[PDB]
């Protein structure tokens, strides 16, 4: 559907967020209860209504995200926290991660939608990519446009959608922008813009070769087997021995266990089990490789080449070098700790889930560092994070050696210690 004009959609997306439309206090909170909508977010992670929302709203204000636009988007879909993504203790904590995600999206550039899963590319009526780039910084469009696929397809490729539709191979979806504007008015998002913004990054990262995927279930079994094998001290117990030796007769048959779904389960298992002489010789040989392309020309290759020189095994097939036993993911640089298995040689650990933390003490030169899916602050990552090696650090700044930064090669780059550690998801020390 397309209930509004092209100028109106553009004006709605041009709105900075920022802009709360002057409905910041009680009126937006009272709407959130009735429009439910917000029923799964009200029941799960129990919040004490308008009064507790008056304690939730300043946290959105602290993160510079519109109180009206966040509550409206929470009503749009729910659930499985608050918006999209998988899991995360409390509602206030769960909200902070969602706000931290928007921070790594509203300033980072991502190629516009126009449909990708389940065939047929939408033929445009060039102007969408022109409009997304026309939008400056922290705007509602810069958050929506890369995420909502169904919305862009009905606004910038309306002619194609109406002529088709269409089941599984063709257009099956509706217009989420219509549903968002209809509920937002139920504040004027078009008239407010015309009568914001006028302000000032491009995404980094790619994916490794990966012979994946045939059997995801095989990876899920080992992750659970090793979880109980590492936590054998609690069992050593009759019921405990039955839980430890539970893996013999198969099979854990899961139909909907997708590659994205397996990784979410594998990272959940990882956050539970979690909580120099070898490097020094090759360090002098690695510093001479700075300025040159080692791969492949990707972040995984420089990490793979460095690991193969120290431990013996690599990550990227182009470095080749023998491969590490792939026990998970895999595709993304968040993370390599988290697949690959370094028990074969020497491992660090330091797995940092969702929020936060950083840990300056867990540095150790020269460890392989992993950056979050969407950073954004120093690297401005997208989907698959970033990876490199640590060279030196001070209680103020950190020197790192990394490859694919907006088109490689191996470059020596210094970042703020606090800003860099915020991007971190994991480290692997030798």
């Amino acid at each position: 559907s397309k209930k509004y004009t092209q100028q109106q959609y553009e004006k709605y997306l041009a709105q900075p967020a920022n802009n709360t439309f002057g409905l910041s206090p009680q009126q937006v909170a009272d709407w959130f209860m009735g429009q439910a909508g917000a029923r799964p977010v009200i029941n799960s992670y129990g919040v004490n209504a308008s009064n507790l929302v008056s304690t939730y709203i300043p946290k959105m204000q602290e993160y510079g995200v519109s109180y009206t636009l966040f509550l409206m988007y929470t009503v749009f879909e729910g659930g499985g926290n608050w918006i999209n993504h998988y899991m995360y203790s409390n509602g206030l904590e769960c909200l902070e991660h969602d706000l931290q995600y928007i921070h790594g999206v509203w300033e980072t550039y991502f190629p516009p939608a126009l449909s990708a899963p389940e065939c047929y590319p939408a033929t445009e009526d060039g102007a969408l990519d022109r409009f997304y780039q026309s939008l400056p910084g922290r705007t509602w469009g810069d958050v929506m446009i890369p995420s909502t696929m169904a919305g862009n397809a009905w606004v910038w490729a309306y002619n194609y959608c109406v002529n088709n539709q269409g089941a599984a191979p063709l257009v099956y979806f509706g217009n989420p922008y219509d549903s968002q504007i209809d509920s937002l008015l139920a504040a004027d998002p078009f008239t407010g813009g015309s009568i914001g913004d006028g302000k000032n990054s491009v995404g980094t990262g790619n994916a490794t070769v990966s012979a994946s995927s045939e059997a995801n279930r095989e990876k899920l079994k080992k992750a659970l087997t090793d979880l109980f094998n590492n936590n054998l001290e609690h069992l050593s117990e009759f019921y405990g021995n039955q839980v430890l030796n539970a893996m013999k007769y198969g099979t854990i048959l899961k139909c909907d266990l997708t590659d994205d779904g397996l990784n979410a389960i594998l990272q959940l298992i990882a956050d539970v089990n979690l909580q120099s002489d070898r490097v020094a010789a090759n360090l002098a040989n690695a510093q001479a490789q700075v300025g040159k392309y080692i791969g492949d020309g990707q972040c995984y290759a420089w990490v793979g080449w460095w690991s193969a020189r120290v431990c013996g095994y690599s990550i990227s097939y182009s470095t080749g070098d023998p491969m590490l036993p792939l026990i998970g993911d895999g595709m993304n640089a968040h993370s390599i700790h988290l697949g690959w298995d370094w028990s074969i040689a020497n491992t660090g650990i330091v797995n940092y889930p969702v929020g936060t933390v950083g840990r300056k003490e867990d540095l150790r030169v020269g460890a392989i560092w992993c950056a979050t899916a969407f950073s954004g602050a120093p690297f401005y990552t997208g989907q698959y994070g970033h990876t490199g090696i640590i060279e030196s650090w001070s209680d103020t700044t950190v020197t790192v050696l990394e490859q694919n930064i907006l088109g490689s090669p191996v470059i020596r780059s210094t970042y703020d210690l606090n800003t860099f550690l915020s991007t971190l998801t994991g480290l692997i020390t030798f």
């Binding site: 599984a168 139909c255 909907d256």
Partner: protein, 65 residues
């Protein structure tokens, strides 16, 4: 996903070889032929999709009956 709540016991079967019978399925001990790809994609979410050669189909029928 919750597949035990579906009330459907069976699997989807097709061949990637030269001679193809398309997509067929066993649903609660009853053999049925799928005509559209939408039904295949829909059922794949609740029941598994496996590969069975045309020559072996006859043997599976006797076991599933």
């Amino acid at each position: 996903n919750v597949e035990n709540v579906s009330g459907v016991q069976g699997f989807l079967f097709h061949t990637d070889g030269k001679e193809s019978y398309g997509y067929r399925a066993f649903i609660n001990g009853v053999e049925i032929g799928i005509k559209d790809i939408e039904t295949v994609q829909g059922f794949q979410q609740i029941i598994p999709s496996i590969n069975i050669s045309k020559s072996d189909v006859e043997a599976i029928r006797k076991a599933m009956k």
